[PDB]
Structure formats: C-alpha cells, structure tokens
C-alpha cells in the first residue's frame, strides 16, 4: 500500500469495516502502520478490530476442521484419506501467517515507540493475544516457548496497567479479561484465571463511583464479561 496516502488508508479501513470486508480492512491498516508514524487511539482500535476479525474467522474455521479431524481419528471411524488433515494444516498455516504479520507490526516498530501507558498496554495486550492464538494451534517443540511469549507480553502489560491506569480503565479491564482466558484455556491455571477475574471485577466495582455516565457504561460492559466467565468457571 506504499503508494496510498496514510489518511486514505485510514479512511478506506473505516469503509472496509462498514462493508464487512475485514481482510481489506487489515491490509489498509497494515499499510497505515508501515508509513512509520505512531497511531492515534482510534487508529490503534481500527488495527486491532481488523485483525481480530480476520483471525477470529480463521480460528473458528480451524476449530471446525480440528473437530472433524479428531472425530476421524476415533475407534470405529472409516479412513477418509489425508484431506481433512491437509486442509486443517492449510488453514492453520494461514492463521499462523496472520498472527506473525501482526506480531511483526508490533515488533517493527509499534511497541518500541509506544511511551504512553494507553498505547503501550494496548499493544502489549495485542502481542499477548496473537501469541495466544499461535498457542491454540501449537503442538511442536516451540509450544512451551509460544505460551511463555504470550504470558510475558500479558504480564508486562499488567504491570504497566496496575501502575498507570485506574482499575476501571477499559484497556486494563480487557487485558485482565484476556489474561484470565489465557490462564484458563492455555496455561492450565483455572484458579489463577478465577482469582484474576474476581479481583479485577471487585477493584473495578469500587472505582465506578468516580466515573461519568458514559465511562460507567464502558467499564460495566467489560465487567459483565468478567462476570460471565466467572459464572461459567465456578
């Protein structure tokens, strides 16, 4: 997208979102990042939304194919050939490529230029998320290292968020939500997931009195997601 103006890429990313053209949206936002300037809050959100939609579709497809593959590998199942595994592998490779692309943007050079807490925490949460999606499909000799990379990114983001943001800040809340999902689903640490979700919820509740009506709505929406997980987990 090197020949398109930064502002035009951003405008077209917004149009692609309205048109539900998320691969286009992600390509426009990748082009915008590659202009080399830091991203505003809105631009960071567009980048994140674009890739969450792309990888979300790939993850859902991978789960469908992985379930079919697992069923075909059961006792009393008829041999259907290599096609299910081959196609699951194709989708998996594509998904890994998207995660590597996002991680590459964060490493070159979004994170190193991010000095304010809101940008740095948001980017480190993204880094944790995309390593988490790599971990969901990992099975080889690097699976432990991929898990540790997700954990390390989330932990750095948590440490900053606790020092620099109020307990109701929506980035702080979403980071804690996603880190608790990492603990529950990836790290085999359901008790850590439950403790994190409960403490995050309770500390946010006690800070709601400081907020405007609109900030209250923002924070309580994410708090309800923490509560939904706690209801499923306990």
């Amino acid at each position: 997208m090197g020949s398109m103006e930064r502002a035009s890429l951003i405008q077209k990313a917004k149009l692609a979102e309205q048109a539900e053209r998320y691969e286009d949206m992600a390509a426009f936002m990748k082009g915008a990042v590659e202009k080399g300037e830091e991203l505003s809050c809105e631009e960071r959100n567009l980048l994140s939304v674009a890739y969450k939609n792309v990888v979300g579709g790939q993850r859902a497809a991978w789960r469908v194919l992985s379930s079919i593959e697992q069923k075909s590998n059961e006792e009393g199942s008829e041999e259907k050939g290599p096609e299910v595994r081959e196609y699951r592998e194709k989708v998996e490779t594509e998904l890994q490529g998207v995660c590597d692309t996002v991680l590459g943007l964060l490493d070159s050079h979004l994170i190193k230029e991010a000095g304010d807490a809101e940008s740095r925490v948001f980017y480190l949460k993204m880094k944790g998320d995309y390593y988490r999606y790599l971990a969901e499909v990992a099975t080889g000799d690097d699976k432990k290292r991929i898990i540790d990379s997700a954990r390390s990114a989330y932990q750095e983001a948590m440490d900053i968020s606790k020092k620099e943001m109020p307990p109701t800040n929506p980035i702080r809340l979403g980071l804690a939500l996603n880190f608790s999902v990492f603990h529950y689903e990836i790290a085999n640490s359901p008790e850590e997931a439950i403790s994190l979700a409960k403490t995050t919820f309770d500390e946010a509740m006690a800070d709601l009195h400081t907020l405007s009506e609109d900030s209250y709505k923002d924070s309580t929406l994410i708090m309800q997601l923490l509560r939904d997980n706690l209801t499923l987990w306990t």
């Binding site: 917004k14 979102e17 809105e42 959100n45 567009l46 994140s48 939304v49 969450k52 939609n53 979300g56 998320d129 979403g174 939500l177 996603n178 999902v181 529950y184 689903e185 997931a193 994410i222 997601l225 939904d228 997980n229 499923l232 987990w233």
Partner: peptide, 9 residues
C-alpha cells in the same frame, strides 16, 4: 470462556 470480542470499532 470468553475473551474481549474486539470486532467492532
């Protein structure tokens, strides 16, 4: 277990 959907600006 649900993460942030994060799919709408």
């Amino acid at each position: 277990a649900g993460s942030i959907p994060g799919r709408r600006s």
